[PDB]
Amino acid sequence: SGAIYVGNYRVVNRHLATHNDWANLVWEDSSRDLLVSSTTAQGCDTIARCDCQTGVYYCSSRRKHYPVSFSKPSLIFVEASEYYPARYQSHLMLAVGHSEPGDCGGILRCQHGVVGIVSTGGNGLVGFADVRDLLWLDEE
Numbered sequence: 035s036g037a038i039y040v041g042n043y044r045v046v047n048r049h050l051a052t053h054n055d056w057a058n059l060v061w062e063d064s065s066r067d068l069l070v071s072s073t074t075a076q077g078c079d080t081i082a083r084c085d086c087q088t089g090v091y092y093c094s095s096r097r098k099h100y101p102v103s104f105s106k107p108s109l110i111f112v113e114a115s116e117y118y119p120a121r122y123q124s125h126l127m128l129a130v131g132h133s134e135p136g137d138c139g140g141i142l143r144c145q146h147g148v149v150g151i152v153s154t155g156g157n158g159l160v161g162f163a164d165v166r167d168l169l170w171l172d173e174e
């Protein structure tokens with residue numbers, strides 16, 4: 035579980051969005067596993083605007099932050115689950131690291147700010163949904 039809070043926006047994994055997030059929808063993309071809803075209070079996270087490939091992510095299943103190298107945002111095959119059928123998820127970045135079902139929403143951060151959130155995993159792998167191309171998160 036977890037979210038990004040920037041300006042008047044809440045960014046969550048689309049598969050974990052509450053019915054109230056849908057009522058307050060701003061933008062969603064199933065292919066990216068992302069949903070953004072509007073918020074009443076202003077948030078204080080800063081989104082990174084960079085091409086960093088090293089950062090630190092939060093792993094709730096170990097109660098630990100880990101330093102990781104990660105691949106550039108790309109179209110990656112993700113196995114079927116209870117949330118999606120087998121498909122290519124876009125804007126996804128992979129790292130060698132622990133992840134399990136329950137770790138989605140953990141922030142990936144670099145020196146510039148928030149890069150993305152945990153979205154997928156595998157045997158010794160963790161995938162992050164990138165948010166650095168969503169320039170509009172910094173305005174209105």
Ligand SMILES: NC(=O)[C@H]1CCCN(C(=O)Nc2ccccc2OCC(F)(F)F)C1
Nearest residue numbers: 067115133134135136137138153154155156
């Ligand atoms: N975005 C998706 O399609 C994910 C929906 C939930 C399930 N997704 C996974 O990748 N499960 C998964 C399978 C084996 C080891 C780790 C796993 O996930 C780690 C995670 F939950 F993302 F933190 C896929």
Ligand SMILES: [Zn+2]
Nearest residue numbers: 084086144146
């Ligand atoms: Zn960066």
